[PDB]
């Protein structure tokens, strides 16, 4: 029988700073045990300082990003070139995903940008459009490897203040863009080592009030 | 998921956990399982995260249109029956929703309606819904009286989620508390199970199964 779904592998990672946000993804595209591309980007500038990635089944991922980009274009036309806030984008994507509730988009979606107070924001979605704002989210094949590391290093989970008898927690604080990119690079090198569908290249999109900057880093190609 | 809502002398107590799962994978510990439909209406979520979140947000739109059209806040009965009539149209399609519509109106007083995705709609004084409902029922039923104080009722609701959060593998994260009075719903904070468990164990002297 014809199976309409496939798995194109790869993994994505979103972290929110005080006045910035990053959305990182590996550039490897696979089917089964074959590499399709070593550089096939899946993190996209969608305009209005929103970056988006829909990792999983690449066909459904491209379709969704395409529809959301188109949604942004028509929002400008219908509402006098008004900027689409990250919260409003998130709700719009929920309706896109839930629209196909009975033939879902087989992808995990993360958007990043700045909220209306100029502070870093990350939103993550399940395949059928349940969503939540977070400081931190990994998605895709190596999500189960990266996410617990982020809990430990970003949100300082299970970390107590030395000599306080495990009574005072390590205080939450915003990370610098330099510190966040270190965690992203170490997250992906670690994921590449232990997951066969992750490697080749890492592409990071950083979102500040000044716009969308890119950074690229080599990963192991085995 | 574990959600409870119970009725007493001082109004309604609504308590929920914050855990979202993808099988044995803990997807999140910071999920809002209570939607504030309006100042006198609360909705609880259990089952499919997308199904609950989408249709309870939609229910809020339908409740707003009612008060624009009828110049009057919708009844808890009418609000619950919009959602129950909606899911009944989708019956057999595979929606998964376990829901409590909790609120106060003048004509009804404090009211709780259970609504699920196979179309069941029940009025009642006590409901627990989710994978950890039996764990919550155990503690709630054995300590429940109508004459509980607002302080005691808030604690029993909080303690009943903690109970389920502990035993049920698919419940935990934190406890979100609400109190519904004649003056509307009041938020009584987010309580991380991480700190709340040890605090309760020490102060209450309970949870003797655990290595202290």
């Amino acid at each position: 029988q014809f199976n309409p779904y496939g798995d194109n592998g790869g993994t994505i990672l979103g972290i929110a700073g005080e006045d910035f946000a990053v959305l990182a993804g590996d550039t490897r595209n696979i089917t089964d045990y074959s590499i399709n591309s070593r550089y096939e980007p899946k993190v996209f500038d969608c305009g209005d300082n929103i970056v988006m990635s829909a990792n999983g089944f690449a066909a459904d991922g491209d379709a969704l990003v395409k529809r959301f980009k188109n949604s942004v274009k028509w929002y400008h036309f219908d509402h006098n070139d008004k900027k689409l806030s990250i919260n409003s984008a998130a709700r719009n994507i929920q309706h896109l995903l839930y629209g196909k509730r009975f033939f879902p988009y087989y992808v995990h979606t993360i958007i990043a940008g700045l909220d209306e107070d100029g502070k870093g924001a990350v939103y993550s979605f399940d395949p059928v459009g349940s969503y939540e704002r977070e400081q931190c989210r990994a998605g895709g094949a190596a999500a189960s490897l990266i996410m617990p590391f982020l809990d430990n290093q970003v949100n300082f989970k299970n970390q107590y203040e030395p000599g306080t008898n495990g009574k005072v927690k390590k205080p939450l604080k915003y990370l610098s863009v330099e510190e966040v990119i270190k965690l992203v690079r170490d997250s992906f090198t670690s994921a590449t080592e232990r997951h066969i569908q992750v490697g080749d290249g890492l592409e990071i999109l950083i979102v500040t009030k000044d716009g969308v900057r890119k950074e690229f880093y080599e990963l192991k190609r085995d | 998921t574990t959600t409870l809502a119970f009725r007493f002398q001082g109004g309604i107590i609504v308590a929920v956990d914050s855990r979202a799962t993808a099988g044995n994978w803990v997807a999140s510990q910071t999920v809002k399982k209570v939607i504030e439909i309006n100042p006198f209406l609360l909705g609880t979520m259990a089952g499919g995260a997308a199904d609950c979140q989408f249709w309870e947000t939609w229910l809020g739109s339908q409740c707003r249109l009612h008060e624009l059209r009828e110049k009057e806040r919708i009844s808890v009965a009418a609000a619950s029956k919009i959602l129950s009539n909606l899911v009944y149209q989708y019956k057999g399609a595979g929606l998964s929703m376990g829901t409590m519509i909790c609120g106060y109106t003048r004509k009804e007083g404090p009211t709780i309606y259970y609504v699920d995705s196979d179309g069941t709609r029940l009025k009642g004084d006590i409901f627990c819904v989710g994978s950890g409902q039996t764990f919550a029922y155990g503690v709630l039923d054995s300590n429940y009286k109508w004459d509980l104080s607002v302080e005691d009722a808030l604690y029993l609701g909080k303690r009943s989620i903690l109970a389920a959060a502990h035993r049920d593998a698919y419940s935990g994260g934190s406890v979100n508390l609400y109190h519904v009075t004649e003056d509307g719903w009041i938020y009584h904070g987010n309580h991380d199970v991480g700190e709340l468990f040890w605090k309760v164990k020490e102060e209450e002297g309970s949870f003797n199964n655990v290595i202290g």
């Binding site: 059928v128 | 998921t1 999140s28």
Partner: peptide, 4 residues
Amino acid sequence: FLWX
């Protein structure tokens, strides 16, 4: 797909 998440569950609660």
